[PDB]
Design an enzyme around this catalytic site. Sequence first.
Site, PDB file in Angstrom:
ATOM      1  N   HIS A  61       0.838  -1.194   0.000  1.00 16.34           N
ATOM      2  CA  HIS A  61       0.000   0.000   0.000  1.00 16.34           C
ATOM      3  C   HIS A  61       0.875   1.247   0.000  1.00 16.34           C
ATOM      4  O   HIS A  61       0.462   2.309  -0.464  1.00 16.34           O
ATOM      5  CB  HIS A  61      -0.905  -0.013   1.229  1.00 16.34           C
ATOM      6  CG  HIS A  61      -1.768  -1.232   1.317  1.00 16.34           C
ATOM      7  ND1 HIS A  61      -2.829  -1.453   0.463  1.00 16.34           N
ATOM      8  CD2 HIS A  61      -1.702  -2.316   2.125  1.00 16.34           C
ATOM      9  CE1 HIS A  61      -3.379  -2.621   0.744  1.00 16.34           C
ATOM     10  NE2 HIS A  61      -2.713  -3.165   1.748  1.00 16.34           N
ATOM     11  N   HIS A  91       5.888   7.056   6.358  1.00 15.95           N
ATOM     12  CA  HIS A  91       5.631   6.570   5.015  1.00 15.95           C
ATOM     13  C   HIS A  91       5.086   7.736   4.219  1.00 15.95           C
ATOM     14  O   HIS A  91       4.883   8.824   4.762  1.00 15.95           O
ATOM     15  CB  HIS A  91       4.593   5.451   5.036  1.00 15.95           C
ATOM     16  CG  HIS A  91       3.294   5.861   5.647  1.00 15.95           C
ATOM     17  ND1 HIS A  91       3.059   5.808   7.004  1.00 15.95           N
ATOM     18  CD2 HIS A  91       2.182   6.395   5.092  1.00 15.95           C
ATOM     19  CE1 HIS A  91       1.858   6.292   7.259  1.00 15.95           C
ATOM     20  NE2 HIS A  91       1.305   6.655   6.115  1.00 15.95           N
ATOM     21  N   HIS A  93       2.440   9.030   0.642  1.00 19.11           N
ATOM     22  CA  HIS A  93       1.296   8.799  -0.230  1.00 19.11           C
ATOM     23  C   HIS A  93       1.668   9.675  -1.414  1.00 19.11           C
ATOM     24  O   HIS A  93       2.111  10.809  -1.227  1.00 19.11           O
ATOM     25  CB  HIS A  93       0.004   9.300   0.407  1.00 19.11           C
ATOM     26  CG  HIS A  93      -0.386   8.541   1.633  1.00 19.11           C
ATOM     27  ND1 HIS A  93      -1.179   7.413   1.587  1.00 19.11           N
ATOM     28  CD2 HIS A  93      -0.045   8.708   2.931  1.00 19.11           C
ATOM     29  CE1 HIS A  93      -1.309   6.921   2.804  1.00 19.11           C
ATOM     30  NE2 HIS A  93      -0.629   7.686   3.638  1.00 19.11           N
ATOM     31  N   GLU A 103      -2.947  13.585   0.519  1.00 17.01           N
ATOM     32  CA  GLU A 103      -4.234  13.187   1.057  1.00 17.01           C
ATOM     33  C   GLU A 103      -4.925  14.445   1.555  1.00 17.01           C
ATOM     34  O   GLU A 103      -6.065  14.727   1.186  1.00 17.01           O
ATOM     35  CB  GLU A 103      -4.029  12.166   2.175  1.00 17.01           C
ATOM     36  CG  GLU A 103      -3.298  10.929   1.663  1.00 17.01           C
ATOM     37  CD  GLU A 103      -3.603   9.687   2.461  1.00 17.01           C
ATOM     38  OE1 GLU A 103      -3.247   9.642   3.654  1.00 17.01           O
ATOM     39  OE2 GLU A 103      -4.204   8.753   1.887  1.00 17.01           O
ATOM     40  N   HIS A 116       3.951  11.044   6.124  1.00 15.48           N
ATOM     41  CA  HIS A 116       3.273  10.827   7.395  1.00 15.48           C
ATOM     42  C   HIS A 116       4.207  10.189   8.409  1.00 15.48           C
ATOM     43  O   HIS A 116       4.648   9.055   8.222  1.00 15.48           O
ATOM     44  CB  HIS A 116       2.050   9.926   7.202  1.00 15.48           C
ATOM     45  CG  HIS A 116       0.911  10.604   6.514  1.00 15.48           C
ATOM     46  ND1 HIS A 116      -0.156   9.914   5.979  1.00 15.48           N
ATOM     47  CD2 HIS A 116       0.664  11.914   6.280  1.00 15.48           C
ATOM     48  CE1 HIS A 116      -1.008  10.768   5.443  1.00 15.48           C
ATOM     49  NE2 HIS A 116      -0.534  11.989   5.613  1.00 15.48           N
ATOM     50  N   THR A 195      -5.824   7.144   7.540  1.00 20.35           N
ATOM     51  CA  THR A 195      -6.345   7.388   6.194  1.00 20.35           C
ATOM     52  C   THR A 195      -6.502   6.132   5.338  1.00 20.35           C
ATOM     53  O   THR A 195      -6.885   6.217   4.169  1.00 20.35           O
ATOM     54  CB  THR A 195      -5.471   8.393   5.429  1.00 20.35           C
ATOM     55  OG1 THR A 195      -4.176   7.825   5.212  1.00 20.35           O
ATOM     56  CG2 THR A 195      -5.335   9.694   6.219  1.00 20.35           C
ATOM     57  N   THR A 196      -6.193   4.973   5.914  1.00 20.88           N
ATOM     58  CA  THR A 196      -6.363   3.702   5.213  1.00 20.88           C
ATOM     59  C   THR A 196      -7.035   2.761   6.193  1.00 20.88           C
ATOM     60  O   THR A 196      -7.031   3.006   7.402  1.00 20.88           O
ATOM     61  CB  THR A 196      -5.019   3.023   4.817  1.00 20.88           C
ATOM     62  OG1 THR A 196      -4.431   2.407   5.974  1.00 20.88           O
ATOM     63  CG2 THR A 196      -4.052   4.032   4.228  1.00 20.88           C
TER      64      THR A 196
HETATM   65  N1  LIG Z   1      -2.066   7.037   6.695  1.00 22.15           N
HETATM   66  S1  LIG Z   1      -1.983   7.068   8.251  1.00 22.15           S
HETATM   67  O1  LIG Z   1      -3.235   7.583   8.716  1.00 22.15           O
HETATM   68  O2  LIG Z   1      -0.772   7.721   8.643  1.00 22.15           O
HETATM   69  C1  LIG Z   1      -1.892   5.381   8.832  1.00 22.15           C
HETATM   70  C2  LIG Z   1      -2.781   4.417   8.267  1.00 22.15           C
HETATM   71  C3  LIG Z   1      -2.728   3.082   8.726  1.00 22.15           C
HETATM   72  C4  LIG Z   1      -1.827   2.736   9.714  1.00 22.15           C
HETATM   73  C5  LIG Z   1      -0.935   3.680  10.282  1.00 22.15           C
HETATM   74  C6  LIG Z   1      -0.979   5.033   9.828  1.00 22.15           C
HETATM   75  C7  LIG Z   1      -0.095   3.031  11.302  1.00 22.15           C
HETATM   76  C8  LIG Z   1      -0.413   1.574  11.214  1.00 22.15           C
HETATM   77  C9  LIG Z   1      -1.575   1.428  10.360  1.00 22.15           C
HETATM   78 ZN   LIG Z   2      -0.390   7.810   5.720  1.00 22.93          ZN
END
Ligand SMILES: NS(=O)(=O)c1ccc2c(c1)CCC2
Ligand SMILES: [Zn+2]
Length: 257
Positions: A61, A91, A93, A103, A116, A195-196
């Site tokens: 992802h 990570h 996006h 996002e 992020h 956000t996922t």
């Molecule tokens: N995209 S986000 O909101 O930063 C995000 C989305 C999913 C997950 C984390 C952070 C940490 C572990 C699972």
């Molecule tokens: Zn993220």
Amino acid sequence: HWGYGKHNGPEHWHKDFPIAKGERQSPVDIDTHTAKYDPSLKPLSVSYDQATSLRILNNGHAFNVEFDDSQDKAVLKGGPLDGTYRLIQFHFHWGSLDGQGSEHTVDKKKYAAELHLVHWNTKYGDFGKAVQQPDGLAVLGIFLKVGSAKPGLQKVVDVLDSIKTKGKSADFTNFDPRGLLPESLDYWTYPGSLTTPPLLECVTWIVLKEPISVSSEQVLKFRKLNFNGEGEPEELMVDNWRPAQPLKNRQIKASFK
Ligand SMILES: NS(=O)(=O)c1ccc2c(c1)CCC2
Ligand SMILES: [Zn+2]
Ligand SMILES: NS(=O)(=O)c1ccc2c(c1)CCC2
Ligand SMILES: [Cl-]
């Protein structure tokens, strides 16, 4: 399972994750004129001096640069936060084109990508318990625009060839995330969610106003990654972003004026 394709993308997530239509979903559009300066906000403190990166992983992802969070090293505090939040991973996006990828949006403007940096509230013991709390996580979001190269990002870019497909990981020690921050810490903040999927509403979002600049070459390499696993048909990892969600009963606060 869930993804970013036509048949498993953001418009489908609610079927398995009903909270997708919740009251505090992320990301959101940041209306700069409606955002209000908040004097109650304390100075933001990003202390990444002792950060210990360990590995980088393609999870199908996006790719996560993971840190050792077994001790209080890289921490985020201050601002709208009560207590100490520990850095666990970061990570990005990004899009298939420079005109999209972020996002969060600013006055509907989409950036090429968004970084992020994920942190969990230490008063909950660990990440797992933290995501069961309304103030369990704090994510520092940073916009990426295409222009001059970001020196501190190159080490990340050059290791991507080793984790091209889903499930692949590689050692990634001694990476200093301080090299991914912009000069200013001015930010907007609001209560949101992941956000996922699972889209848990346990996040305090802190989105920096100043974007960092990355080169076209750098983002192009992000787009060479794969959503698929090794030996499967190639599906480039691009446009792994969720669009803005309803703000509903929330107010975005600014740390500046
Ligand atoms: N995209 S986000 O909101 O930063 C995000 C989305 C999913 C997950 C984390 C952070 C940490 C572990 C699972
Ligand atoms: Zn993220
Ligand atoms: N609801 S969801 O998590 O986006 C999701 C999960 C699995 C599958 C679809 C959608 C469509 C094909 C299989
Ligand atoms: Cl596709």
